[PDB]
Amino acid sequence: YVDMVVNAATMMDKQNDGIELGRQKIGVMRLNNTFVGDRTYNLRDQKMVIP
Amino acid sequence: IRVLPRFSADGQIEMSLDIEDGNDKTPQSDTTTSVDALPEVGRTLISTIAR
């Protein structure tokens, strides 16, 4: 009984080891009060840009 | 006019604005007899953001 139990358990353990459980997700977020992209202003003769 | 509009959830519109206006400099209109000149406006440049 003891030997069967220990063997079966140790085989089950290495068999299930390929299961992948860590996963990535995508979150969408709208800005309400500002422009999302890097922002250009044109001065009289020149563009200048803010991150 | 050059413009870029944005909707804000408060029911407000935000615009990036470039405005240029005026009339062409004309030394050639040498005449005195036309004191009834077409009205001399200036020339003006503005760039800004407003909400």
From Swiss-Prot, chain A:
It is found in: Cell outer membrane. It comes from Salmonella typhimurium (strain LT2 / SGSC1412 / ATCC 700720). Belongs to the bacterial secretin family. T3SS SctC subfamily. The core secretion machinery of the T3SS is composed of approximately 20 different proteins, including cytoplasmic components, a base, an export apparatus and a needle. This subunit is part of the base, which anchors the injectisome in the bacterial cell envelope. Forms a stable homooligomeric complex. The complex is composed of 15 subunits. The gene is sctC1. Component of the type III secretion system (T3SS), also called injectisome, which is used to inject bacterial effector proteins into eukaryotic host cells. Forms a ring-shaped multimeric structure with an apparent central pore in the outer membrane. Disruption phenotype: Insertion mutants are hypoinvasive in the HEp-2 cell assay. This is SPI-1 type 3 secretion system secretin.
